[PDB]
């Protein structure tokens, strides 16, 4: 699959050789072309994966993730060029270089055939994200956010590395196909328990799991808009993809090692949904929303059924699109009024009607209105959990009630009521912002038209 | 670590003084010449791990 990797590496010098006032145009055009090329990976088989070479392969789980990454790059470029107008040419090129390097690392991460190569790329994604956050964030807290983003990740991933090399000394291979075909059960010993924890905790902190999630509100609030987009839409899904890959060697230990994580996921989903009800910062609300949806995904991965895996795949794709759109919507208001307080600017439907329509559609997809793929993933996970235990419908049910509430709360706070009298600098929406919202939302409904493309290998 | 310059060039910078069974002036023998000679001839060429046993 070098036909996708090489054009991004070519985006790099194309950006660094462009004329000073053509960087955005060229980057956007060729990013969109690369997304169009990557669209061909959706032609998948029913039996095995597309094994391109000894190094790269494509499954029915990673292809929609690659398509989402390549589609998110142009949207990030469109969202970034407004607040970077005053920047120097070299620093703008460096920012675009960070975005391109992040895309390259993600593309290679989602298609690596070996687990150590996957680990190396999945750690390599850290550097551009940290640089973006700590260099182009707006407030002084960004520095702290960066630290919280880094060590929380590494404290999870350093044990995993050890486990990985240990496994290669035991079975002789880390190739995923060999690992799947030559699978052997895990006995019930303390050594196996700690191997399970080492294999699981890095992905758990990536999702993130409730209790290990404190880095996420900081990092996703303090980051620039493109950073928040790529953190919510793609980088959270690394944990889910890695967990679904790694669980093939953890049976039957998972059968009882999942209980603390299942309890944490369900109760913390309720807790983060409740937290969303009392939030003064609009970005923090969206971050805690991401935490709740990812708790659902964790439950789906932990119960290990075909329906739960399909639901997890659909939910990851849908959440990526929806959360990126919500972050962009909040960023428009922030750029207008330079404040993230939700109750500062009210009654925006009177001043910006089309943006209010975009807000309504985004909040409708957040609460999983049928037949959106958000609802499809949520319903598949809920059905699988009901099969796992009939009592789960209580907690899941409560979540469905809370989500809508806070979702509509957000809308009602920003669009309805009366406008703030002293805010007189609310200009009409630009074509760029409307196009960004449309390019977020139209693929969601188009995917609803054909849902088997995001349902995964199961 | 050890660059065997002496072995590569055949110089003998310090090997003349490593053992007591090696060409003393006036052929004066060490007190334990025979024992060291026997041990060296036993251990020659088989490596330290095998020689230790």
């Amino acid at each position: 699959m070098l036909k996708i990797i090489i054009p991004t590496t070519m985006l790099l010098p194309m950006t660094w050789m462009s004329k000073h006032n053509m960087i955005w145009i060229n980057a956007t055009v060729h990013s969109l072309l690369i997304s169009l090329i990557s669209l061909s990976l959706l032609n998948q088989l029913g039996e095995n994966s597309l094994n391109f070479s000894l190094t790269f392969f494509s499954d029915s789980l990673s292809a929609p993730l690659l398509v989402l990454t390549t589609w998110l790059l142009p949207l990030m470029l469109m969202a970034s060029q407004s607040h970077l107008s005053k920047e120097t040419t070299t620093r703008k090129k460096l920012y675009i270089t960070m975005l391109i390097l992040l895309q390259l690392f993600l593309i290679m991460t989602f298609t690596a055939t070996e687990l150590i190569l996957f680990y190396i790329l999945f750690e390599a994604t850290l550097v551009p994200t940290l640089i973006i956050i700590t260099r182009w964030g707006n407030q002084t807290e960004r520095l702290n956010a960066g630290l919280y983003f880094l060590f929380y990740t590494l404290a999870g991933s350093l044990p995993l590395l050890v486990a990985l090399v240990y496994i290669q000394n035991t079975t002789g291979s880390l190739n995923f196909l060999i690992i799947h075909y030559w699978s052997h059960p895990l006995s019930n010993s303390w050594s196996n328990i700690f191997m399970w924890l080492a294999c699981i905790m890095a992905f758990m902190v990536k999702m993130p799991l409730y209790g290990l999630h404190l880095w996420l509100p900081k990092a996703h609030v303090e980051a620039p808009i493109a950073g928040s987009m790529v953190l919510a839409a793609v980088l959270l899904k690394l944990g889910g993809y890695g967990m679904m890959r790694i669980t093939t060697i953890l049976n039957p230990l998972t059968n009882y090692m999942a209980y603390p994580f299942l309890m944490l996921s369900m109760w913390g989903m309720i807790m983060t949904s409740s937290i969303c009800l009392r939030q003064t910062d609009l970005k923090s609300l969206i971050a805690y929303s991401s935490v709740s949806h990812m708790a659902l995904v964790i439950v789906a991965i932990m119960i290990q059924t075909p329906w739960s895996f399909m639901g997890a795949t659909a939910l990851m794709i849908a959440h990526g699109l929806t959360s990126s759109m919500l972050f962009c919507l909040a960023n428009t208001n922030y750029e207008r009024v330079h404040s993230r307080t939700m109750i500062l600017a009210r009654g925006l439907q009177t001043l910006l009607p089309l943006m209010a329509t975009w807000w309504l559609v985004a909040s409708l997809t957040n609460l999983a209105l049928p037949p959106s793929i958000n609802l499809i993933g949520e319903l598949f996970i809920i059905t699988a959990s009901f099969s796992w235990s009939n009592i789960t419908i209580i907690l899941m049910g409560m979540n469905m009630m809370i989500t809508a509430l806070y979702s509509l709360y957000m809308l009602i706070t920003t669009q309805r009521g009366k406008y703030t009298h002293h805010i007189n600098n609310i200009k009409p929406s630009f074509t760029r912002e409307n196009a960004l919202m449309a390019l977020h939302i139209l693929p969601l409904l188009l995917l609803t038209l054909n849902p088997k493309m995001i349902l995964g290998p199961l | 670590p050890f660059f065997d310059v002496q072995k590569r060039l055949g110089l003998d910078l310090d090997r003349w003084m490593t053992i007591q069974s090696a060409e003393q002036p006036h052929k004066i023998p060490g007190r334990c010449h025979a024992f060291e000679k026997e041990w060296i001839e036993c251990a020659h060429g088989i490596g330290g791990i095998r020689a230790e046993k």
Binding site: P185, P252 | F2, D4, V5
Partner: protein, 122 residues
Amino acid sequence: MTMMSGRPGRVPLQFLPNEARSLPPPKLTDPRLVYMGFLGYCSGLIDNAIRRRPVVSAGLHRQLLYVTSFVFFGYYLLKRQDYMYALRDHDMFAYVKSHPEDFPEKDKKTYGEILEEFHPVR
């Protein structure tokens, strides 16, 4: 521990024994050589940047020398690395051949005769 220092017949500071001449040399389009040339080009660009010269255009002779030197060293480095891996494989196979008691080939069993425990997922 040192695996290969005391390997019999090893010339102290050779860097390339004559036996290594029996191995196929790396191709001049080897991707590792291309990456070494890329490292040389990056070194030239950084040299231009540190000296406050136009990064891409300042010295073409200097950049050419950078790339050439990196490729020239990389060729011999790759030759030595391939020789060392060939030596390791040769020694491993000879040792397995000379100690059949420690490496037995046991009887093969098909999956229709192997009892594997089934763990249901529910």
